[PDB]
Design a binder for this molecule. Structure first.
Ligand SMILES: *[C@@H]1O[C@H](CO[C@@H]2O[C@@H](C)[C@@H](O)[C@@H](O)[C@@H]2O)[C@@H](O[C@@H]2O[C@H](CO)[C@@H](O)[C@H](O)[C@H]2NC(C)=O)[C@H](O)[C@H]1NC(C)=O
Ligand SMILES: *[C@@H]1O[C@H](CO)[C@@H](O[C@@H]2O[C@H](CO)[C@@H](O)[C@H](O)[C@H]2NC(C)=O)[C@H](O)[C@H]1NC(C)=O
Ligand SMILES: *[C@@H]1O[C@H](CO)[C@@H](O)[C@H](O)[C@H]1NC(C)=O
Ligand SMILES: *[C@@H]1O[C@H](CO)[C@@H](O)[C@H](O)[C@H]1NC(C)=O
Ligand SMILES: *[C@@H]1O[C@H](CO)[C@@H](O)[C@H](O)[C@H]1NC(C)=O
Ligand SMILES: *[C@@H]1O[C@H](CO)[C@@H](O)[C@H](O)[C@H]1NC(C)=O
Ligand SMILES: *[C@@H]1O[C@H](CO)[C@@H](O)[C@H](O)[C@H]1NC(C)=O
Ligand SMILES: [Zn+2]
Lengths: 596, 195
């Protein structure tokens, strides 16, 4: 017999014992996440241990079939996933050291408290506490106190761990036939094989840079507008040609600029659209919210929800009898079991979160027929994009008037439009430079272009050049500011947000073009459009069986990530901002510093 | 008048696995097919050759009733000219088949919390299966070029695998009970027909 037949039989026996074991682990995890009890923790631990042991044992048996003997493009993909070694290539002592380092950093981040000066009897944690001071305070010294304290206590206790972390994580990557850890992370976008759809691990950086070179004007105008409006709240601390201090951005790190809305509203007299009062006055429940979301999904050709969805899902807080984890989540237990975990309340935010979660559930339902190892999104970016595009369409005034939550004599003006666009831009456009910086810095650190004695310096030279922010006080090589973020102390990738943000607007533009919409792109509803659902379903049902370039081409027509759909979304805001910034200076200088 | 024993076939307490299905021969009785229309929920009631309404006034020589249990998404595999695990290694129907196929859900009787591992099917076989043939062997399947010596290991597999049926599964993964009726008119005198 040939190696290919042998591999097919091995995969047949895998795809049958993996499903059972995974279902028993998922059910244990769900039972632990609904109740809370020591018995449930023990069952979850036992199920996870059995699943991990099975997967580790099956990974070794797959190293007998050489990858070059197989030409099927579907058997090869499943074997490539199994043949990955991971941390098993290291010595046992180094593996224990790496695990200890990771656990120590996670524990240090999780239980870090800052005590106010000259008073041991008052100490604040990250959440709640400092997160409220950095989001709801209009003082200057109080924000600086927390900003310096969190990076002085927690930050300086993590750098020696981080150095050995980098040293150990590079050895594993070089042992797994890579260049460094950044290459290992970037290997998720690699496509080898099929002609006309190949993608290399070095093309991602060039694509990201080429895209970011087109976002700069809009971000510059937004930065200028925010700087002009922030001079009225801190009159003597902001320079009109300088950079924004890092402790006045509505967040502890500056990842999002949402909390500046009350300070930067274009027209403060006209309120936004809130349907909470209408929701309460018509006796609405969580059941009706989910029924409306299901009706919206059915209106475009997608199927119903299974009968087990309405019986095995928990949509309300149990009460004092039980104790659950109130975090929205979509569960795909396998073998036709789909569930949503959510503590729903009567509010617009939950009304949109229901659409997000049921979009996730539909995307999971799309590829249920594929093999076990190919039951996932095309890459780490397509899942949340499909989740978000459902929430964009459900918040339009036309959709609200169609379902009765809004009065039919309500006329929309051109000022609430600018308010909504600015609110969207403060969250979507304000986070892209931050992500691009963080991944560029981590990539350069892993590659070796930044010597260990010049880390912090670089971190504060790029922030002035890409994001446009300046530190309030000087820092030296005894700090590790990047480690103060959750995704750095805990090992996680972070470019997924950039990719998803760029994908979602492409998807929305394609679906709106399919629905024959006429007008601005942000006034688009894909309801009652069957042709816009079949195009999405053609991509949803592939999974990982095809390259992400082909899956993207099935929807947008192109095979690369593009930025123009994002810019078409914010055009009126761009024009208004250009008109508003006719008496200010657009841009910043990297020389001004508050501590000069 | 001796009615044919259709009750002890449809209403049996325990059914059999697919790889060892149960066959029962029916002769020397009068057949009433209206009682077969009890058990109102039928996932599938299909009939090839004879018609369900005209089945009463037709006289045959023997009737074979074959019973087993499968999962939901394999019922469409119990028709003539089908390919797959059930139709190649477990149970095969001829292309000139005359007779009826009935399949109905049994989630409330064949599902347990924690798993029902008493139902098994065959996954590996050297060759395909001839029509109306049974294989109950439990020999180790060799998928390589090295002898197995009757011990499971590398490239040597155990042919039979269980299901695990649980009450929280989907419709396509839930148990279904299946009965197949085949009518044979041989050169022997006809005996089996209705009122
Ligand atoms: C989506 O369509 C439904 C159904 O409306 C019908 O089908 C459409 C494709 C179109 O051909 C309409 O002209 C048809 O009447 C809409 O629900 C109806 O909306 C109208 C609006 O006047 C209302 O009078 C009916 O009572 C509604 N029927 C219901 C609720 O069962 C729905 O509003 C459309 N969604 C939109 C426009 O976003
Ligand atoms: C995962 O690690 C195993 C060993 O830890 C690798 O298997 C060895 O690969 C080398 C490569 O030259 C061979 O010489 C050895 O004979 C293999 N077996 C053993 C027991 O060492 C395996 O290749 C690694 N996986 C990948 C994808 O490289
Ligand atoms: C899980 O919650 C239910 C609901 O009250 C309770 O009856 C059950 O005892 C809980 N499980 C455990 C193991 O306590
Ligand atoms: C790859 O193998 C699968 C196995 O079922 C087969 O269906 C498919 O056609 C094969 N691909 C090609 C290109 O032959
Ligand atoms: C979805 O369910 C509703 C109510 O149960 C039903 O009216 C509708 O026909 C169903 N849609 C489909 C496609 O089955
Ligand atoms: C909105 O419409 C009014 C009506 O003339 C116009 O004066 C104004 O410039 C428009 N734009 C904004 C941002 O108000
Ligand atoms: C099957 O047996 C049960 C138990 O005696 C009985 O209640 C039921 O009526 C029987 N089915 C038919 C079709 O008579
Ligand atoms: Zn989500």
């Amino acid at each position: 017999s040939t190696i290919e037949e042998q591999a097919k039989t091995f995969l047949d026996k895998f795809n049958h014992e993996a499903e059972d074991l995974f279902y028993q682990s998922s059910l244990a995890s769900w039972n632990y996440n609904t109740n809370i009890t020591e018995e449930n923790v023990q069952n979850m631990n036992n199920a996870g241990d059995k699943w991990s042991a099975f997967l580790k044992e099956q990974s070794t048996l797959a190293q007998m079939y050489p990858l070059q003997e197989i030409q099927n493009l579907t058997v090869k993909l499943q074997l490539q996933a199994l043949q990955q070694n991971g941390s098993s290539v290291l010595s046992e002592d180094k593996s224990k050291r790496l695990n200890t380092i990771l656990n120590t950093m996670s524990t240090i981040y999780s239980t870090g408290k800052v005590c106010n000066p000259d008073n041991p009897q008052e100490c604040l944690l990250l959440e709640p506490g400092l997160n409220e001071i950095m989001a709801n305070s209009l003082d200057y010294n109080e924000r600086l106190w927390a900003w310096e304290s969190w990076r002085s206590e927690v930050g300086k206790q993590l750098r020696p761990l981080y150095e050995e972390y980098v040293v150990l994580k590079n050895e594993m990557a070089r042992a797994n036939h890579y260049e460094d850890y950044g290459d290992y992370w970037r290997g998720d976008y690699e496509v080898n094989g099929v002609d006309g759809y190949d993608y290399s691990r070095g093309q991602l950086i060039e694509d990201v840079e080429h895209t970011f070179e087109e976002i700069k004007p809009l971000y510059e105008h937004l930065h200028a507008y925010v700087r002009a409006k922030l001079m009225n709240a801190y009159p003597s601390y902001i320079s009109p040609i300088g950079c924004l201090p890092a402790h006045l951005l509505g967040d502890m790190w500056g990842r999002f600029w949402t909390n500046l809305y009350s300070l930067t509203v274009p027209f403060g007299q006209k309120p936004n659209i809130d349907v909470t009062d209408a929701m309460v006055d018509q006796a609405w429940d969580a059941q009706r919210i989910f029924k409306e979301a299901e009706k919206f999904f059915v209106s475009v050709g997608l199927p119903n929800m299974t009968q087990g969805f309405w019986e095995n899902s928990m949509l309300t807080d149990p009460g004092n009898v039980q104790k659950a984890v109130c975090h929205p989540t979509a569960w795909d237990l396998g073998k036709g079991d789909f569930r949503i975990l959510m503590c729903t309340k009567v509010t617009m935010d939950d009304f949109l979160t229901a659409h997000h979660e049921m979009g996730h559930i539909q995307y999971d339902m799309a590829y249920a027929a594929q093999p076990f190892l190919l039951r996932n999104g095309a890459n780490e970016g397509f899942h949340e994009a499909v989740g978000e595009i459902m929430s964009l369409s459900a918040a339009t005034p036309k959709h609200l008037k169609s379902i009765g939550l809004l009065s039919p004599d309500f006329q929309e003006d051109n000022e609430t439009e600018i308010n909504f666009l600015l609110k969207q831009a403060l969250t979507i456009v304000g986070t892209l430079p931050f992500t691009y910086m963080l991944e560029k810095w981590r990539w350069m650190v892993f590659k070796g272009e930044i010597p260990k004695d010049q880390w912090m310096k670089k971190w504060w030279e790029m922030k002035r050049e890409i994001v446009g922010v300046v530190e309030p006080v000087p820092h030296d090589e005894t700090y590790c500011d990047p480690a103060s973020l959750f995704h750095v102390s805990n090992d996680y990738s972070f470019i997924r947000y950039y990719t998803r943000t760029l994908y979602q607007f492409q998807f929305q533009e394609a679906l709106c073009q399919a629905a024959k919409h006429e007008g601005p792109l942000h006034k688009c509803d894909i309801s009652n459009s069957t042709e816009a659902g079949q195009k999405l379903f053609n991509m949803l049902r592939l999974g990982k069986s095809e390259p992400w370039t082909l899956a993207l081409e099935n929807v947008v027509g192109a095979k690369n990530m593009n930025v123009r759909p994002l810019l078409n979304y914010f055009e009126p805001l761009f024009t208004w901002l250009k008109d508003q910034n006719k008496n200010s200076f657009v841009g910043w200088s990297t020389d001004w510093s508050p501590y000069a | 008048t001796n009615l044919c024993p259709f009750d002890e076939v449809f209403n049996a307490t325990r059914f059999a696995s697919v790889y060892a299905w149960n066959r029962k021969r029916i002769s020397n009785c009068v057949a009433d097919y209206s009682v077969l229309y009890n058990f109102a929920p039928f996932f599938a009631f299909k009939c090839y050759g004879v018609s369900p309404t005209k089945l009463n006034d037709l006289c045959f020589t023997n009737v074979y009733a074959d019973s087993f249990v499968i999962r939901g998404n394999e019922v469409s595999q119990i028709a003539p000219g089908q390919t797959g695990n059930i139709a190649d290694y477990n149970y095969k129907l001829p292309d000139d088949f005359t007779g009826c196929v009935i399949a109905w859900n049994s989630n409330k009787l064949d599902s347990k919390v924690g798993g029902n591992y008493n139902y098994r099917y065959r996954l590996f076989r050297k060759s395909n299966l001839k029509p109306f043939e049974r294989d109950i062997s439990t020999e180790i399947y060799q998928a390589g070029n090295k002898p197995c010596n009757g011990v499971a290991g590398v490239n040597c597999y155990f042919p039979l695998q269980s299901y695990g049926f649980r009450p929280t599964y989907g419709v396509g993964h839930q148990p279904y009970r299946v009965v197949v009726l085949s009518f044979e008119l041989l050169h022997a005198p006809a005996t089996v027909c209705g009122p």
